[PDB]
Amino acid sequence: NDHINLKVAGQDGSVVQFKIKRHTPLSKLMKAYCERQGLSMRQIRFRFDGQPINETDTPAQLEMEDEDTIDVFQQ
């Protein structure tokens, strides 16, 4: 039950969903999204509810819910 499904929505209109553990640091998700897409990480920014996401932040700490969306765009 410690699993959560998050939508990662890019500026290009793409959406990729991720199943992750709620106490896993979100850096794993962010790194997976960049690797999958072929993106360089230095460029892009992840936002949740308009705010930035620390690499160490976890879904539990941010009170994320199943099917919430993470926005991603480049600087």
Binding site: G13, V15, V16, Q17, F18, K19, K28, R36
Partner: protein, 91 residues
């Protein structure tokens, strides 16, 4: 999302596999919708693709839902990844 060429490739795959397994002759037309779900909680990391595609069944255009499973999550590996059609049905 649904008009990317990797999605089109998996859609054709789903249609081709469905045609072999069922001895059918559906003809691929287009993808109308595609959800991509990467599962990071388990090994091996896998992706599930839920495809809504349009295919000709004897001149009639119909809508189908397919589930395609992939043993991989990097797009750069997708062409050579192991894949399975796990579900194909009219929506």
């Amino acid at each position: 999302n649904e008009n990317s060429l990797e999605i089109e490739e998996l859609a054709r795959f789903a249609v081709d596999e469905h045609n072999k397994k069922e001895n059918a002759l559906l003809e691929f037309v287009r993808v109308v919708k595609a959800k991509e779900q990467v599962d990071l909680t388990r090994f091996p990391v896998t992706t599930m693709y839920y495809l809504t595609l349009e295919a000709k069944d004897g001149g009639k255009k119909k809508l189908y839902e397919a589930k395609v499973w992939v043993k991989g999550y990097l797009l750069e590996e997708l062409k050579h990844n192991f894949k399975e059609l796990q579900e194909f049905k009219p929506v």
